[PDB]
Amino acid sequence: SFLLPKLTSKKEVDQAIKSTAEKVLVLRFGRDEDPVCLQLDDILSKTSSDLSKMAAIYLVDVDQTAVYTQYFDISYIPSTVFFFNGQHMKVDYGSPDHTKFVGSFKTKQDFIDLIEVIYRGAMRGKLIVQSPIDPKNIPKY
Amino acid sequence: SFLLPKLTSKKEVDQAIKSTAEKVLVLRFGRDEDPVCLQLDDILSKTSSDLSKMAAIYLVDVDQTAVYTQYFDISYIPSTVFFFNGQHMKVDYGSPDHTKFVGSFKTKQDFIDLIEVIYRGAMRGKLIVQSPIDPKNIPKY
Numbered sequence: 541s542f543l544l545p546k547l548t549s550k551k552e553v554d555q556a557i558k559s560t561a562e563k564v565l566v567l568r569f570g571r572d573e574d575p576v577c578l579q580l581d582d583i584l585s586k587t588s589s590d591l592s593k594m595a596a597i598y599l600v601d602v603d604q605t606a607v608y609t610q611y612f613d614i615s616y617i618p619s620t621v622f623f624f625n626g627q628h629m630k631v632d633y634g635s636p637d638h639t640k641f642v643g644s645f646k647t648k649q650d651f652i653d654l655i656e657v658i659y660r661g662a663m664r665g666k667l668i669v670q671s672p673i674d675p676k677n678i679p680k681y
Numbered sequence: 682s683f684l685l686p687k688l689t690s691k692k693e694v695d696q697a698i699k700s701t702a703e704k705v706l707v708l709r710f711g712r713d714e715d716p717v718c719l720q721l722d723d724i725l726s727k728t729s730s731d732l733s734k735m736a737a738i739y740l741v742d743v744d745q746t747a748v749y750t751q752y753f754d755i756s757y758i759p760s761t762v763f764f765f766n767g768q769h770m771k772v773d774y775g776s777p778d779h780t781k782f783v784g785s786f787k788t789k790q791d792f793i794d795l796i797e798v799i800y801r802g803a804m805r806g807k808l809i810v811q812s813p814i815d816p817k818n819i820p821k822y
């Protein structure tokens with residue numbers, strides 16, 4: 541894109557939501573050094589060019605964006621949130637929470653496939669889409 | 682007014698979310714004839730005027746438009762959703778779902794006190810707030 545932008549404040553996330561027009565805004569909430577975020581971030585970086593017409597991808601430091609981290613109840617990282625023209629786009633990936641996509645992707649193409657689904661739903665005026673793919677597994681207690 | 686505005690299509694809801702500036706937008710998803718909706722609509726109507734500096738209230742017909750009902754995962758009516766400057770507000774009532782209030786308020790004052798807290802927090806940039814309502818007064822269902 542080439543590079544992935546980093547956001548480190550509530551105000552920067554607000555500005556990305558407000559200024560990103562006609563593309564899916566992808567907000568990866570995480571920590572750059574977290575191993576699962578490192579895995580996702582590599583997919584994001586690699587796929588970003590092929591998705592540049594459909595999506596603008598930003599990395600967000602979960603620890604520095606309290607208003608958003610608390611609002612989305614980010615409890616496991618990475619957690620990725622989607623917006624389109626200032627509307628929060630929800631994604632049903634079979635789990636009860638449609639608000640954020642928790643975990644990394646199996647493959648780069650799975651991520652592209654999700655993004656296409658979001659984009660084409662949002663262009664049609666949809667606000668919630670079903671994901672054609674399932675997330676990679678996040679182990680819990 | 683006493684007779685709160687009705688929204689009967691997705692585009693009308695989209696527009697109220699965009700057009701309500703600097704006040705809490707209150708969206709009541711329900712049916713005007715339903716008994717619990719009648720209880721809640723009486724409180725919304727009777728408090729609307731003295732809340733008019735802090736909130737704009739709308740009645741959303743779930744039998745004429747349904748896009749938003751799926752978007753907010755609404756299974757039971759009434760369900761009431763809060764927004765501020767285009768972005769959804771969460772409220773922790775003491776139950777797991779912070780995205781919407783389900784059922785009717787026990788008293789006028791509970792709704793007033795809630796709007797006060799939502800408005801002040803939203804004006805300070807918050808997106809999630811703590812409900813002030815005593816849990817004994819929160820419908821359980």
Ligand SMILES: OC[C@H]1O[C@@](CO)(O[C@H]2O[C@H](CO)[C@@H](O)[C@H](O)[C@H]2O)[C@@H](O)[C@@H]1O
Pocket residue numbers: 613615773775776777
């Ligand atoms: O993930 C648990 C952690 O989240 C907080 C909010 O930061 O509260 C959430 O989880 C509580 C326990 O499940 C819920 O009862 C509450 O509704 C929810 O917001 C913390 O208080 C909690 O330690």
